[PDB]
Each structure stands twice: as C-alpha cells, then as structure tokens.
Amino acid sequence: SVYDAAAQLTADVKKDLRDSWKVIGSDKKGNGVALMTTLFADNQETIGYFKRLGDVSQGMANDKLRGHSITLMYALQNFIDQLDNPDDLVCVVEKFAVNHITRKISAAEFGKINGPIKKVLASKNFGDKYANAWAKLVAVVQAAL
Amino acid sequence: SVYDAAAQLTADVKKDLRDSWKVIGSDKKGNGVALMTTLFADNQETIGYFKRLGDVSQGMANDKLRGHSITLMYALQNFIDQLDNPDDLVCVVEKFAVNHITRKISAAEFGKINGPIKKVLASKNFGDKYANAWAKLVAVVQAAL
Ligand code: HEM
Ligand code: HEM
C-alpha cells in the first residue's frame, strides 16, 4: 500500500532526506550520472532495459544518458518538495511508477537502486543513516509497482 | 538545429523567463493544473490525447491529472535551470521531445501550449513581453519535433 508506505516517512526521515538532498541535489548532472553509471557497473543485468540510451559506458559523454540522468534528479526533487503533503506525494509517485510499469520494471528490480544511492551518498560523507532514509522513500515507489 | 534555437536565447530573454518563473514556478501544483485545464478549455481537440488521466474536467480532484501537472512544471524547472548551458538544455529538451514524439505530437500541436501559457502569465500580471519570451523557449522544443 503506497499510502502505508508514505506513512513511514516520519519527521526524522523527512529531515534526513532534506539535509542530504541539499548537498547531493546541488549537482544534478554530476551526481545523477554517477548514480546511473554506478547502477550499470554494479548491476550489469539492468543495462538491457536502457537500450534507448545507446552506449551507457560512455558516461557523461553520452548525451542521451546525461539528459536522462538530469531529468531523473528532478523526479527526486519533485518527491522532496511533496513531502509535506502525502496526497500530492502519492500522486506524483504513481505517475513515475507508470513510467516504469510500462518498461516492465518490478518492485524488486527498482530496489536495485538502493545500492548505488548508498555509494553516491557515502562518497559525499553521508552514511547508512542517510542511505536508510532514502531506502524508505524508494520503498514508497516500490509499493506502486 | 535544436542547438541553434537554444543558443539564440539572449540574456534579456533568459532574464524575463527567470523572473516570471520565480512567481509562476513557486506554485507548481496550482499553476500547473491551471495550465492544463486552460489547454483543455481552449483546445478541446487535445482532450483525447490524455485518456490515461481519466476525467480531466475533475481538475484538482483528479489525482492522475494533478500528478501529471506537477511533473510538467518540473520539466519546465529543468529547462529554466539549464538556460546558461545550451549543451545541457539541448540534451534535456531532446529527452522530453521523445516523450511527445512517441505520442505523435507534432511541432504545431505542441505550440498550442502558447495560448494557455499567455493566460497563466497574465493572471499574474506578466504581459506580452513575457509570453513572447516563453514562446521562444517552446520553439526550442519545437525544433526537436
Ligand atoms: C531513484 C529511482 C529512480 C527514479 C527516480 C527514476 C526516474 C526515472 C525517470 C524520470 C524516467 C523517465 C520516464 C519517461 O520519460 O518515460 C525513467 C526512465 C526509466 N527508468 Fe527509472 N528511475 C529510478 C530507478 C530505476 C531503476 C532502478 C531501473 C531499472 C532497474 C529503472 C528503469 C528505467 C527505464 C528502463 C527507463 C526508460 C529509459 C528510456 O528508455 O529512456 N529506473 N526513470
Ligand atoms: C510547456 C509544454 C509542455 C511540457 C513541458 C510537457 C511535458 C510533459 C511531460 C513531463 C510528460 C510526461 C512524459 C511521460 O512520462 O511519458 C508529458 C506527457 C504528455 N504530453 Fe506534454 N508537455 C507540454 C505540452 C504538451 C502539449 C501542448 C501536448 C499536446 C497538445 C502534450 C501532450 C502530451 C501527452 C499526450 C502526454 C502523455 C500523457 C500520459 O498519457 O501520461 N504536451 N508532457
């Protein structure tokens, strides 16, 4: 239940999401591409889904990948801005869920993003505490897949 | 090319885009829904394209329409943030262009958004100069369609 999942976002979780986002969200192009490349590097079996982006091993040099990455960061920006209103958070989450449901992405495979997120956060000096906070936001999306 | 259209946006145009977005963009849910509803009111022929959103006459009450509207405003947020780097603006514009190319939206049909934009701008007292500034940003997307 996406609604029960959203209720898991307590005051402490929301604060950690915001604090960490202020830092990582300041460089959407850099951190966005880092997130994606890390995903492809640690989970090669997911690369097939991104056929449209071309050669993802080119990283920042790949225009399609860069465009994709930046846009992805704005989806997270959307989520963060909706934290005060669970009804609005839910409707945007379900909107992006659809984009993945059509791509045949399951809740389990969507969860493979948690590894990359922890690594990107770690490189910015944010530990498990912040990684666990984001796992909870990711869980809201998973509940809608 | 799309780059040509992007690279043309002058300092004065970027200024009007940013000043108007500061206001309109501060209420993404309210202004995004008004933009969509205005499009359906003045161009009823486009209603058919949004069948996934259900009953669009429901306005704010329609969760799917609300989620779509908020998300559309973040695509604009994305554009606004990439203004000083044509290379990044282009790759994100092309990304969203694919989203519409897939729905068989022509450059002409996409330009229908200009009327609604003008009205939303006017409701906040932003005149023709600002509407023309936005028509120029829309043209960047049209160059990709
Ligand atoms: C932090 C979590 C994630 C967010 C916020 C996110 C966001 C997005 C966004 C905004 C798009 C563009 C939607 C569209 O225009 O159709 C997208 C596309 C896509 N996503 Fe995700 N995504 C996430 C995780 C994942 C994961 C883990 C997978 C794969 C295991 C995945 C697979 C896809 C695929 C296949 C596409 C289509 C790419 C294309 O053809 O352009 N996403 N995602
Ligand atoms: C300022 C201009 C506009 C922007 C920034 C914009 C942005 C967006 C975004 C972000 C999506 C979601 C893409 C996806 O997840 O697949 C979308 C979908 C769509 N757009 Fe636009 N759009 C604009 C104007 C228009 C206009 C004028 C039309 C056609 C008359 C149009 C028709 C569509 C359709 C049919 C969809 C699919 C909706 C669905 O089934 O979910 N768009 N647009």
Curated annotation (Swiss-Prot), chains A, B:
CDD domains: Mb-like
Compartments reported by the entry: Cytoplasm
Source organism of this protein record: Anadara inaequivalvis
Keyword Heme listed: yes
MF terms (GO), sorted A to Z: heme binding; identical protein binding; metal ion binding; oxygen binding; oxygen carrier activity
GO CC annotation terms, alphabetical: cytoplasm
Entry keyword set: Cytoplasm, Heme, Iron, Metal-binding, Oxygen transport, Transport
Protein name in the entry: Globin-1
Globin domain location: 8-145
